[PDB]
Amino acid sequence: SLIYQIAKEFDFCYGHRVWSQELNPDFSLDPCLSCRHLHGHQGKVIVHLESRELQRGMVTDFAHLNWFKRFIDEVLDHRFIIDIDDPLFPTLLPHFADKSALVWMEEGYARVDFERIKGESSPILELYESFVVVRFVPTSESIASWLLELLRSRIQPLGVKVSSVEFLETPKSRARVYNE
Amino acid sequence: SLIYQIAKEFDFCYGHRVWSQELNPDFSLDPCLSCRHLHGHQGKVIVHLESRELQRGMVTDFAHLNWFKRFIDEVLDHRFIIDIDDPLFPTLLPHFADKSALVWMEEGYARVDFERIKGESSPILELYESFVVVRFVPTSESIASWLLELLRSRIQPLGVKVSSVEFLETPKSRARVYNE
Amino acid sequence: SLIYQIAKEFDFCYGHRVWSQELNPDFSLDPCLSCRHLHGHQGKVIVHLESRELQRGMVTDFAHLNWFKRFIDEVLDHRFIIDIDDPLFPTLLPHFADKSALVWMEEGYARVDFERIKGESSPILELYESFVVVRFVPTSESIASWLLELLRSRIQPLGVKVSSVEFLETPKSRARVYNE
Ligand SMILES: [Zn+2]
Ligand SMILES: [Zn+2]
Ligand SMILES: [Zn+2]
Numbered sequence: 001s002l003i004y005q006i007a008k009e010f011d012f013c014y015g016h017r018v019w020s021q022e023l024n025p026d027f028s029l030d031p032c033l034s035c036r037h038l039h040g041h042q043g044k045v046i047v048h049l050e051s052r053e054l055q056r057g058m059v060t061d062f063a064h065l066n067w068f069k070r071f072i073d074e075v076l077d078h079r080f081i082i083d084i085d086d087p088l089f090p091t092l093l094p095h096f097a098d099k100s101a102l103v104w105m106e107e108g109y110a111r112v113d114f115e116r117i118k119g120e121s122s123p124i125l126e127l128y129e130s131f132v133v134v135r136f137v138p139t140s141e142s143i144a145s146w147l148l149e150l151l152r153s154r155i156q157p158l159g160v161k162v163s164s165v166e167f168l169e170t171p172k173s174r175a176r177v178y179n180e
Numbered sequence: 181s182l183i184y185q186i187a188k189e190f191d192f193c194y195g196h197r198v199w200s201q202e203l204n205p206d207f208s209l210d211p212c213l214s215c216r217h218l219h220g221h222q223g224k225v226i227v228h229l230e231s232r233e234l235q236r237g238m239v240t241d242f243a244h245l246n247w248f249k250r251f252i253d254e255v256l257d258h259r260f261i262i263d264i265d266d267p268l269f270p271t272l273l274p275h276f277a278d279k280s281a282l283v284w285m286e287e288g289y290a291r292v293d294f295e296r297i298k299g300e301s302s303p304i305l306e307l308y309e310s311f312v313v314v315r316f317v318p319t320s321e322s323i324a325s326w327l328l329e330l331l332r333s334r335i336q337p338l339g340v341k342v343s344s345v346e347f348l349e350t351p352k353s354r355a356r357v358y359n360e
Numbered sequence: 361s362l363i364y365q366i367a368k369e370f371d372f373c374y375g376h377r378v379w380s381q382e383l384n385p386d387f388s389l390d391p392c393l394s395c396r397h398l399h400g401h402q403g404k405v406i407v408h409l410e411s412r413e414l415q416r417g418m419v420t421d422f423a424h425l426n427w428f429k430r431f432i433d434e435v436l437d438h439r440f441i442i443d444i445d446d447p448l449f450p451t452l453l454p455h456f457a458d459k460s461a462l463v464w465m466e467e468g469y470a471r472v473d474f475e476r477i478k479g480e481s482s483p484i485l486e487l488y489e490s491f492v493v494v495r496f497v498p499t500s501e502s503i504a505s506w507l508l509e510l511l512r513s514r515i516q517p518l519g520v521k522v523s524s525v526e527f528l529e530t531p532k533s534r535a536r537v538y539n540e
Contacts, residue, residue: 002328003358004321009351020416027424027518035421056200057319061215062353064207139417141364148362158207172369173422180361181540182508184501189532236380237499241395242533244387338387 005163006059007048010069012077015040015130016138019086045072045147046166049155060158068151071107080130081138084110093131095120102133107150109134140167140175148177185343186239187228190249192257195220195310196318199266220260224354225252225327226346231339240340248331255289260310261318264290273311275300282313287330289314320355323347328357365523366419367408370429372437375400375490376498379446400440404534405432405507406526409515420518428511431467440490441498444470453491455484462493467510469494500527500535508537 018035025031047068051059082089090097093112101113110133117128136142144167151162161179168174198215205211227248231239262269270277273292281293290313297308316322324347331342341359348354378395385391407428411419442449450457455477462470470493477488496502504527511522521539528534 001360002325003360004325005356005358006321006354007356008353018417021421022416023421023423024518027427028421029426029430030423034423054319054321054325056202057198057317057322059321059355061201061203061208062349063203063210066209067207070209137417139414141366141414141419142417145362145364145414158204169422174367175419176365176367178363178365180363182505183538183540184505185536185538186501187534187536234499234501234505236382237378237497237502239501239535241381241383241388242529243383243390246389247387250389337384 001052003050003052004054004059005048005050006062007046008062008065010045010047010065010072012043012045012072013040014043014076014078014132015080016082017086017088018137018139019083019088020137041169043076043143044166044168045144046168047147047151047162048164048166049158049160050163051160055159060160064158067154071150075107075109076132079132081132081134081143083137084133084135085137093128095124095128108146140169140173141177143167144175144177148179152179181232183230183232184234184239185228185230186242187226188242188245190225190227190245190252192223192225192252193220194223194256194258194312195260196262197266197268198317198319199263199268200317221349223256223323224346224348225324226348227327227331228343228345229335229338230341230343235339240338244338247334251287251330255287256312258310259312261312261314261323263317264313264315266317273308275304275308288326320347320349320353321357324355324357328359332359363410363412364414364419365408365410366422367406368422368425370405370407370425370432372403372405372432373400374403374436374438374492375440376442377446377448378497378499379443379448380497401529403436403503404526404528405504406528407507407511408523408525409520410523411520420520424515424518427514431510435467435469436492439492441492441494441503443497444493444495446497453488455480455488468506500529500533501537503527504535504537508539512539 015038017038021033021035023031047065049059095117096112101116102110103113104110112128117124144165148162148165155162164176164178166174166176195218197218201213201215203211227245229239264279275297276292281296282290283293284290292308324345328342328345335342344356344358346354346356377398381393381395383391407425409419444459449459456472461473461476463473464470472488477484504525508522508525515522524536524538526534526536
């Protein structure tokens, strides 16, 4: 049986930190918890779709992931991705410490309610425009699992399967989650 | 148990069009059928070969794909790949509108019979030297499947399996066909 | 079911030769056994690790291969890799022509015992500091197999599996060994 796959890459830049990172120094050599620092990455998502047959020579058209490109562009690019359980949440989002005025979207992330910060200065608005709040520690593996969940929920009308999602955190390191 | 694989890349440039392209505008956002345009690509073929044991430390020598290199270089590079059943076939190859005087090669493509255009102008000859005629819409997935068939039928005397072939249409998007 | 993987790349430069290379000319086209020449490469090791669950959002931390990066950097980079059974071993290492006075390490390579050439000229010392002696023909498949072995033997206390190792001989060609 032949299996047919297609894969597309989507790029974006973001900041995050991995607040729970723990290391075994026998393996890391240096015990410093550097992923607990505020930092950032150039991310690449690679979506793999699969069929057991071709329709008009295709698994499905590459342009059929255009809505997802739009999601990556409009929601994640040039943003800071923060775990709602991050202990620095009330420190970095002090106008939203009690976690009450967050607006959860269907895709599973939150933006702050900007109504609550009306009449704050421009730099303060820029700050809060930055945050994409998620309910998971934003590791490459976590992000990849979340994007796999989103794709799965939405791709079914195309008649193909999402077989895996890769998330490259740097050009030399990446995560992959397979949908078996 | 271990499985051993080798993979090798082969590059070429070509023109084509995907004449049958259709889009679901809910997923693509734009309904424009841009792949129906005459265009081109830098293509990359990746061949994956597999064995369950190493012979002399190898799956098989990388150079044992040289004949396949020659094929890509001599047949596909700097050519325009066209489906025999593209509706524009008669328009782009008017001297061969009946599709009879084509010379089909063992690998499953054709060139025009140049006897029938003998004495045509130099530019007309250069036009007909361009075409590689195939029996499929030349999508990334169809190209990958075709080259997989070609490799499966030839590599037997090497004692190795072809496990899959990848075809990169752009650095951002690619197809893979798995033999199994 | 979901399966989680991470992969990380490690780069190094080295010299070797494949003393035992043979070719079938129906496939290589050219019979010349060029891999038997002394030469070298830019190598890339890609380590894939797998787990059936995430812990703190991770398969395991990318930094848990820092010991492996050190091994690559300190043992393999800017070295010449030679099989102890290369017919040229006595010619290239004439002060260790009997192939004893080698110091084998747990990772499965040897360096010469420098006590034996104490007192020799500086250029002679430089020559011998170059060699990494191994018990296989140093093909890409063999290097990958060996690195896989080292990784499996070390990674067990982290509770993840080494699923495969890729070893890139050139940008265009690579080996992969899967741990099935
Ligand atoms: Zn990070
Ligand atoms: Zn195209
Ligand atoms: Zn070599």
